[PDB]
Design a protein around this ligand. Sequence first.
Ligand SMILES: [Mg+2]
Ligand SMILES: [Mg+2]
Ligand SMILES: [Mg+2]
Ligand SMILES: [Mg+2]
Ligand SMILES: [Mg+2]
Ligand SMILES: [Mg+2]
Ligand SMILES: [Mg+2]
Ligand SMILES: [Mg+2]
Ligand SMILES: [Mg+2]
Ligand SMILES: [Mg+2]
Ligand SMILES: [Mg+2]
Ligand SMILES: [Mg+2]
Ligand SMILES: [Mg+2]
Ligand SMILES: [Mg+2]
Ligand SMILES: [Mg+2]
Ligand SMILES: [Mg+2]
Ligand SMILES: [Mg+2]
Ligand SMILES: [Mg+2]
Ligand SMILES: [Mg+2]
Ligand SMILES: [Mg+2]
Ligand SMILES: [Mg+2]
Ligand SMILES: [Mg+2]
Ligand SMILES: [Mg+2]
Ligand SMILES: [Mg+2]
Ligand SMILES: [Mg+2]
Ligand SMILES: [Mg+2]
Ligand SMILES: [Mg+2]
Ligand SMILES: [Mg+2]
Ligand SMILES: [Mg+2]
Ligand SMILES: [Mg+2]
Ligand SMILES: [Mg+2]
Ligand SMILES: [Mg+2]
Ligand SMILES: [Mg+2]
Ligand SMILES: [Mg+2]
Ligand SMILES: [Mg+2]
Ligand SMILES: [Mg+2]
Ligand SMILES: [Mg+2]
Ligand SMILES: [Mg+2]
Ligand SMILES: [Mg+2]
Ligand SMILES: [Mg+2]
Ligand SMILES: [Mg+2]
Ligand SMILES: [Mg+2]
Ligand SMILES: [Mg+2]
Ligand SMILES: [Mg+2]
Ligand SMILES: [Mg+2]
Lengths: 222, 156, 51, 148, 53, 185
Amino acid sequence: AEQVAAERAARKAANKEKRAIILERNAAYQKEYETAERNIIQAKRDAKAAGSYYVEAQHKLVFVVRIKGINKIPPKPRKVLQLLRLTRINSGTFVKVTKATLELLKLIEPYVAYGYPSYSTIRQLVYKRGFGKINKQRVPLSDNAIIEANLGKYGILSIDDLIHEIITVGPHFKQANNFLWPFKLSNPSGGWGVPRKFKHFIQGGSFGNREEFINKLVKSMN
Amino acid sequence: SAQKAPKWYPSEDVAALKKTRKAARPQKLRASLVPGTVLILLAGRFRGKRVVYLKHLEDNTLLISGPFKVNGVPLRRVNARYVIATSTKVSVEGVNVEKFNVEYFAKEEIKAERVEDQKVVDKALIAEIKKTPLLKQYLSASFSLKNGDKPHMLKF
Amino acid sequence: VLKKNPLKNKQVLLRLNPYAKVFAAEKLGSKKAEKTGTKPAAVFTETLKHD
Amino acid sequence: PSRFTKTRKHRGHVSAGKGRIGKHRKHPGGRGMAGGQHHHRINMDKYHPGYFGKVGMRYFHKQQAHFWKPVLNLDKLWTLIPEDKRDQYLKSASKETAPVIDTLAAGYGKILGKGRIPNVPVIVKARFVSKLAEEKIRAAGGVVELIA
Amino acid sequence: RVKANAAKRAEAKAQGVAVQLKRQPAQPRESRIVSTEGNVPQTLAPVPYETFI
Amino acid sequence: GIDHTSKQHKRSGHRTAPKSDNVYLKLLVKLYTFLARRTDAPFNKVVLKALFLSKINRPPVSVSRIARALKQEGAANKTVVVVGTVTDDARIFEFPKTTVAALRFTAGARAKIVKAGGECITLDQLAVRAPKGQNTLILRGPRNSREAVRHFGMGPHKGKAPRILSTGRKFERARGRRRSKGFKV
RNA sequence: AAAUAUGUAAGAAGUCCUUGUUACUUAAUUGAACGUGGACAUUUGAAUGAAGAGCUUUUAGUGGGCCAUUUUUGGUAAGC
RNA sequence: GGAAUACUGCCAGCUGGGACUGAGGACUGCGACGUAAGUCAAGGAUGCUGGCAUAAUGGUUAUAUGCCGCCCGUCUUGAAACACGGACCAAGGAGUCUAACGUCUAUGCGAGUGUUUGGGUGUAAAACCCAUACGCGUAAUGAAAGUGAACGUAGGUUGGGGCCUCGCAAGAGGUGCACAAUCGACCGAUCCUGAUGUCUUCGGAUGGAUUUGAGUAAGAGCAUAGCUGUUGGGACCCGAAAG
RNA sequence: GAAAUUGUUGAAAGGGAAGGGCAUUUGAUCAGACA
Ligand SMILES: [Mg+2]
Ligand SMILES: [Mg+2]
Ligand SMILES: [Mg+2]
Ligand SMILES: [Mg+2]
Ligand SMILES: [Mg+2]
Ligand SMILES: [Mg+2]
Ligand SMILES: [Mg+2]
Ligand SMILES: [Mg+2]
Ligand SMILES: [Mg+2]
Ligand SMILES: [Mg+2]
Ligand SMILES: [Mg+2]
Ligand SMILES: [Mg+2]
Ligand SMILES: [Mg+2]
Ligand SMILES: [Mg+2]
Ligand SMILES: [Mg+2]
Ligand SMILES: [Mg+2]
Ligand SMILES: [Mg+2]
Ligand SMILES: [Mg+2]
Ligand SMILES: [Mg+2]
Ligand SMILES: [Mg+2]
Ligand SMILES: [Mg+2]
Ligand SMILES: [Mg+2]
Ligand SMILES: [Mg+2]
Ligand SMILES: [Mg+2]
Ligand SMILES: [Mg+2]
Ligand SMILES: [Mg+2]
Ligand SMILES: [Mg+2]
Ligand SMILES: [Mg+2]
Ligand SMILES: [Mg+2]
Ligand SMILES: [Mg+2]
Ligand SMILES: [Mg+2]
Ligand SMILES: [Mg+2]
Ligand SMILES: [Mg+2]
Ligand SMILES: [Mg+2]
Ligand SMILES: [Mg+2]
Ligand SMILES: [Mg+2]
Ligand SMILES: [Mg+2]
Ligand SMILES: [Mg+2]
Ligand SMILES: [Mg+2]
Ligand SMILES: [Mg+2]
Ligand SMILES: [Mg+2]
Ligand SMILES: [Mg+2]
Ligand SMILES: [Mg+2]
Ligand SMILES: [Mg+2]
Ligand SMILES: [Mg+2]
């Protein structure tokens, strides 16, 4: 009987081909990320040269964390919370922005906090707290083979493929994002920076869209 | 019977431990602990005695001597976490120290090898101590926290 | 049995993401940016300091 | 048996399953069929439409067995021949020898038409036949012999 | 939308596919460059309290 | 706390083993769970659960209901499976041959199958002949022909048969059953 | 003439072609209804979610309620 | 003009002090470092040293100390209540049994089923055996006289597990029990039609109808037993004024 | 020959009740386990 080193070296070799593919991909993404990031920087500078104004395309991706406890919630916001999978306090998810999800975010503003996540906080959300849904069962993503197993259908064979398909709002974002179990964050470590959570951010509380400030919060909760 | 007895008994076969992965890597002492440095012993028999640091033994402990004829403290093992490394230092270039290892301290009154090793090491040190005045008396006197001493403040 | 956090476990960091090695070897978290000299037109500067 | 009864399970709970508010009293609805026209009427119509009032003729001293008329469909019929004798008769379906089935002797009073007997001729002696039952008997080349 | 989705179906497949006939919601808008040409920002401030009755 | 979107700790609601205590039925199950675990074959997974069903959900399949199913086009050489008892029907005069795998055959029913030169097989004999259930036709009896379902859904204008003991006129036929007394249902 | 609240629709139970049945209906093989035969697959027709969906039987307790924000009636008001 | 700096953000940059935890128990995975052989911090703690071998550690207990803690039972929107019962202790002390039943379940047998009124018999209130009947089921519908269930592969259509054929597979076609939806057919009632004939008033074929039935359309029952539920009974237990 | 309840003896606590929860000091008492 073979397979001793036989299909060991058929697999281990096949596993090198994939890590090869992943390495090759994650290198391109990094080029994508920073060239896209520099193009914007230089666009804001070119527009100021010509005397004009460059306006950033409004964000297509949003990260929502439920700020409010379980009880005394009116029914209509309470279902939206469920349909966004925030059923527990400090549990976040990603939501792609369209009018049809924008109205949802409107309904739940007093119970959540959300804003525009940076590549950094998405990377550090998935690496530390990312879990998949496989026959329900909430499996941790500790090896790229779990992801390819259930997301390979769409592309997406690596943990970073996931991360890419998320931040870019891919064609498959729905399947990519629903695959991720809702992130369960801890309470912030530096506290909330506010004396009362349940006013709006603008009002000196924590709720509603705080834009890029969602990162310092989420990082203290991750 | 008084009790029926089970339908199932545990296997009395005791299993094997999983193959653990913990390498024993070496202890890197803090930069303040360098041979020739004077130490303050914080605990044990010789607590509060000021003493000279010689060699770092394979069991992680430090090798010190008093010198014996100064403060009464012999060639001895001491734990690097019960000691205060001071700034004041003497050169150990003229002390041998190679002879001294863990086995040398196996339990297995004083053996004459020790009384002699104590004299060869201490004579080298005292040769050096006398170079810097009052260093000998410093080593003969015990350390104590006085009133108003704030360890988290004091330089050593 | 026990989840290991890639963000502090260099082993697990590398089991995912082989590109981590290249990244660190090439710095790349500190990548120094193209030094270019554009300056803003007067309009931008005038209306910025306007009232 | 009593040890499986749920009243063993209720021991220690104050109310025996009977509620603290509304208890277990003697006869809150009244007794028996009381109120079929008043407080219990919603249950009476729906679950018992037709309960109240009369219909039709009284018959004084009506003896059942005046009306005794057990009914047997062609659906069976042939079952009235023991199966050993039976199979012998199906093959050789004929006049000049055709099985005589006395249905009165079998405990039946009327032969109805449920359907489909094979084409074997039969002589069926009965007190009463449905019209279709007899037509079908004829279409197999048998007859009915009215008895009493 | 059915007889429209039938049109761009045939008129695409017979061309070699590339369809996209499901409806999408309002997307966030793209980036754009607004010119200052003939248009300089007109600076406004809050007005004081008046009465006029 | 979790805002619970569904009732927690809910049982599947489906029988898992038979509620029966019959060792042989337990053994038959033991067989077919194995078969259903290792065969990837639809027939075995279905047969497993049929063994769990109560006497109500195992209506008898008659020998004439069997004879019918073999008159389906291309069905005449298939072996019919009845997970449950099989009953005789004096109403068919010609029974085909076949091979019938059931839990039980009544005296009369097995006779009529064998008299025509058929075969009465126990379910385990059928597993050996057809592990993946090849060339099988499963028949279920008429579940809703119980006398009890007559009275289910009783109510106004439902046409549903009162729960009654003595019948005839004089029994629940007048007010509410006809336009001339009160109303009609 | 709002805001909030509310009915319906967002496909395979769909769409198009051909041309059968009738006692209804038409001036009329006209129509109406139900069809036989044929053409196009999942970017098959918005979003989000889905520890699945559907269904049947039987039976408990309950059938004094009270409170808060907002709307609001009677009362000067009320822990009415 | 040329720098610095703050502020905000990023680094898969390095590094120190402290705390809790150490689940698992051969191997199996994904990897990392090496020219290599090997090695590792990579699917959960090991190494080295010391002390006691004991009331040392631990359990129980009494007490002290910090913080906390109102009377139980009940009816109630609301009880610690300035609502009731209860001084204490033991021992009694309340959903039962029966008749007839609904849903469900187990079991026997199944178009049937039920030995136990009785008889036979007996190691004698048991066990074993049994003829005739009877009961319920196998026909329904009418107030009744009465009549009484296949146009047809026991129907058409739509969904339908399973199985069958083709295909490597994805798929496609074939057959389709249970069940569900829908249009029809059959029996009785009601209403209409009223042939052939006739003791000229009998007879009621035949074809129909927004009518109607607890029906037919390849039977599902009968019996024992159990929980729960129903009715009558002293009816879960104790309680009138009365008659 | 239980309990309520009582005498004696022994121990302990007690500034307008007592009793109770978590925790530890102290006293008393005790199991197991080393080899
Ligand atoms: Mg989401
Ligand atoms: Mg801080
Ligand atoms: Mg803090
Ligand atoms: Mg405050
Ligand atoms: Mg944290
Ligand atoms: Mg190792
Ligand atoms: Mg070190
Ligand atoms: Mg009972
Ligand atoms: Mg209970
Ligand atoms: Mg309770
Ligand atoms: Mg109850
Ligand atoms: Mg009570
Ligand atoms: Mg009440
Ligand atoms: Mg009556
Ligand atoms: Mg019946
Ligand atoms: Mg019936
Ligand atoms: Mg709406
Ligand atoms: Mg989903
Ligand atoms: Mg599911
Ligand atoms: Mg009720
Ligand atoms: Mg009620
Ligand atoms: Mg009322
Ligand atoms: Mg640290
Ligand atoms: Mg362990
Ligand atoms: Mg001890
Ligand atoms: Mg102790
Ligand atoms: Mg001991
Ligand atoms: Mg004491
Ligand atoms: Mg207190
Ligand atoms: Mg009150
Ligand atoms: Mg009071
Ligand atoms: Mg009272
Ligand atoms: Mg009292
Ligand atoms: Mg007692
Ligand atoms: Mg006797
Ligand atoms: Mg006998
Ligand atoms: Mg006799
Ligand atoms: Mg009868
Ligand atoms: Mg009759
Ligand atoms: Mg009296
Ligand atoms: Mg009186
Ligand atoms: Mg005595
Ligand atoms: Mg106590
Ligand atoms: Mg002992
Ligand atoms: Mg001991």
